[PDB]
């Protein structure tokens, strides 16, 4: 009964559907009746060509604003170099119109799509905050294919206004269910960057999305970290296909690439999921992603099984998004219990790092208290430390269920002597584990240099609930 789109470039959208099994299983969600109708997605980027032949039919001025020039119209600024094409490419991935004889189709081709023009200018804390906090009772899902520089030396995250926007968004946005923030995990692969040094992706309030190539490999630009939640397809080498989407000047491109293309596809899949159950909270959505994402046919050297039997990789999170499985599970989903937060200050004295430091602590995770956690969601190791060359450090955190999260891998370009100032390294890899028991933090010098420093604070911050577990996978 379901008829797939007839758009001229839809056959080239290999990541949406195919018999090959290397796809995001989006046609199966369309066939269940979910195409995005009623859901509102906003692309936070360099603007959106609101009159594009493949976007006009879905464009939503209520999802749009121009923060750079302070006006309602997010139209890109046209230049000879087409610098401001990025947001329009992202928008088409989410919600390009279907069955209109133009280009291809969005994942959620009946969703409403807007854009915030906010990258074409100085991107201040206030600019980010006004973008993240735009019309939060109209916009359901925010997609951000941007962030701190991927030079492999930077440690940077949201400043005060932006962090307040995240908290206000997940607390009061979408009728109190919480804004959905989807983030691209980054393009710093060639610089050996770590997406845990990026406070936007590392945030518990964002769904950080990584990339896989068509042949199922870790792309050259990919950043590994423990905060990544899941993966969608994007570009790879020149024998692998790329992403088909709307381009600047009313054109169609078949060569959209990089981390930038993965977040919009995830945002589209989340739009389909919200259509299947509008009552999902921001935490519900992360649970659905954890439970339904698929490792199979993704190649990595670091796949590990966590304490509840789920495979997890620092390149891929829980694996490829599966749109059909997301919308199926969403329909009868029971809202998760309110989020508990258990704060455990680990150190009794500062500890010299030297060549290697191992800190073991047995915790009760707030046993006997209203914030008792037996079902982990996010875990953070908030670390304050000094060190003479930051990029020589590697940091690992082992859960009581034996799951070893790489909080920080060596970054050869990070020469900083600034250390970490209460930096909240986050891992998703122990999701649904019982956090009671022995946690182990390992800090090691990966170089032959006689480095030196001191760990002065280690706060283990656990988020989660105390009810509703599934039998382990």
């Amino acid at each position: 009964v379901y008829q797939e789109p007839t758009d001229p470039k839809f056959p080239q959208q290999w990541y949406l559907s195919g018999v090959t099994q290397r796809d995001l299983n989006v046609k199966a969600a369309w066939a269940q009746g979910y195409t995005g109708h009623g859901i509102v997605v906003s692309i936070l980027d360099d603007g959106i060509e609101k009159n594009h032949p493949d976007l006009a039919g879905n464009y939503d001025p209520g999802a749009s604003f121009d923060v750079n020039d302070q006006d309602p119209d997010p139209q890109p600024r046209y230049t000879q170099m087409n610098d401001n094409r990025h947001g329009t490419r992202c928008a088409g991935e989410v919600a390009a119109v279907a069955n209109n004889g133009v280009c291809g189709v969005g994942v959620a081709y009946n969703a409403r799509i807007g854009g915030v023009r906010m990258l074409d200018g100085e991107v201040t804390d206030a600019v980010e905050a006004r973008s993240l906090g735009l019309n939060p009772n109209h916009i359901h899902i925010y997609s951000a294919s941007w962030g701190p520089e991927d030079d492999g030396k930077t440690v940077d995250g949201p400043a005060r206004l932006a962090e307040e926007a995240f908290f206000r968004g997940v607390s009061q946005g979408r009728g109190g269910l919480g804004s959905i923030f989807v983030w691209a995990s980054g393009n710093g692969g060639r610089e050996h960057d770590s997406c845990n040094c990026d406070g936007y992706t590392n945030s518990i309030y964002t769904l950080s999305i990584s990339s896989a190539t068509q042949f199922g490999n870790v792309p050259w630009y990919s950043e590994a970290c423990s905060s990544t939640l899941a993966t969608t397809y994007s570009s790879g080498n020149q024998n692998e296909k790329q992403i088909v989407t709307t381009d600047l000047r009313q054109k169609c491109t078949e060569s959209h690439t990089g981390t930038s293309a993965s977040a919009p596809l995830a945002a589209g899949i989340i739009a389909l999921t919200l259509e299947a159950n509008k009552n999902l909270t921001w935490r519900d959505m992360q649970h659905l992603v954890v439970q339904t994402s698929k490792p199979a046919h993704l190649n990595a050297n670091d796949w590990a099984t966590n304490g509840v039997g789920r495979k997890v990789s620092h390149s891929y999170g829980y694996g490829l998004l599966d749109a059909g499985a997301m919308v199926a599970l969403a329909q009868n989903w029971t809202t998760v219990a309110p989020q508990r937060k258990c704060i455990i200050d680990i150190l009794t004295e500062p500890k010299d790092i030297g060549k290697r430091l191992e800190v073991r602590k047995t915790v009760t995770a707030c046993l006997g208290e209203p914030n008792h956690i037996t079902r982990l969601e996010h875990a953070q190791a908030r670390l304050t430390l000094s060190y003479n060359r930051r990029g020589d450090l590697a940091i690992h955190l082992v859960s009581p269920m034996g799951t070893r999260s790489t909080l920080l891998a060596a970054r050869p370009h990070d020469y900083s002597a600034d250390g970490f100032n209460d930096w909240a390294f986050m891992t998703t890899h122990s999701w649904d584990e019982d956090p009671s028991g022995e946690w182990v933090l390992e800090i090691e010098n990966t170089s032959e240099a006689n480095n030196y420093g001191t760990l002065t604070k280690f706060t283990l911050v656990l988020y989660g609930t105390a009810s509703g577990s599934l039998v382990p996978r």
Binding site: D45, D46, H86, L119, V123, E128, S145, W146, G147, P148, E149, D150, S260
Partner: peptide
């Protein structure tokens, strides 16, 4: 910073 912030980059695309």
């Amino acid at each position: 910073x912030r980059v695309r």
